[PDB]
Amino acid sequence: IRPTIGQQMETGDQRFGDLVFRQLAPNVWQHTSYLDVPGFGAVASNGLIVRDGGRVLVVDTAWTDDQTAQILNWIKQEINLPVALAVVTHAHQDKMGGMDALHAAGIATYANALSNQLAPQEGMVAAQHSLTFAANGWVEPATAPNFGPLKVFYPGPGHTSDNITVGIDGTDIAFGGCLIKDSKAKSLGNLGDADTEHYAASARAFGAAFPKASMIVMSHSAPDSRAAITHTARMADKL
Numbered sequence: 001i002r003p004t005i006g007q008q009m010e011t012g013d014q015r016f017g018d019l020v021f022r023q024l025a026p027n028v029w030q031h032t033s034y035l036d037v038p039g040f041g042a043v044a045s046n047g048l049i050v051r052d053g054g055r056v057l058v059v060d061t062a063w064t065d066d067q068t069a070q071i072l073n074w075i076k077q078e079i080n081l082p083v084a085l086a087v088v089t090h091a092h093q094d095k096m097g098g099m100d101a102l103h104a105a106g107i108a109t110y111a112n113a114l115s116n117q118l119a120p121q122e123g124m125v126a127a128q129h130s131l132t133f134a135a136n137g138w139v140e141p142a143t144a145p146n147f148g149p150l151k152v153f154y155p156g157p158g159h160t161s162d163n164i165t166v167g168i169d170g171t172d173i174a175f176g177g178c179l180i181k182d183s184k185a186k187s188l189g190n191l192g193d194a195d196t197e198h199y200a201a202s203a204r205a206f207g208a209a210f211p212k213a214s215m216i217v218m219s220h221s222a223p224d225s226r227a228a229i230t231h232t233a234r235m236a237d238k239l
Ligand SMILES: CC1(C)S[C@H]([C@@H](C=O)NC(=O)Cc2ccccc2)N[C@H]1C(=O)O
Pocket: 035, 037, 043, 092, 093, 094, 095, 178, 188, 189, 190, 191, 219, 220
């Protein structure tokens, strides 16, 4: 789609409307949507789709309701199984812009309690359910019922104070959202809402939470190696 930011199209990718889908594993797909900033071009944002038996789980919306409805259409066409729930990884437009489409479809939505509290101030609609976390960052399991392979971890403040991450159990994939940047990145992206003091520790805590994940998925670059984690932390060390 030639985005100004985000990965470019490659052989594995499937174009569907204005979105791009890439299979990462037999049961995991990356969804990519684009926001056109006037005079600046398209910014890509990635999330995940995970099949868990007879149901589908989603991580992050697209930028908009319409794009998010297109994700649901793609799932309907290509997988033809119901979406059980969606997790959104913090209260910004690239991750929560499409909440209304999820709610219209009857899909149960989950976010960090802090994301839900921040959502009005960030121009977002809150998720219908709040996740809470232990002092070491692991989600309280009572707040994440029937999450299947999704293992939710709060690594500490970084890109935002509310950013969360998700490992996919039964695979070697973990999703760092906007916290993690790729191994070739020259910046940490938008630090406007960031905690620059704690960023490096939070990036490394994500790595330690999922020590055997070899494929690191993130919001604005193609999936990368664990060097994404180490490079992000090294960049954050200089903050
Ligand atoms: C890609 C970014 C630099 S922008 C994005 C986030 C702000 O965090 N911003 C939004 O979601 C709102 C937005 C609206 C219109 C155009 C760009 C961003 N996330 C940043 C990041 O991951 O580093």
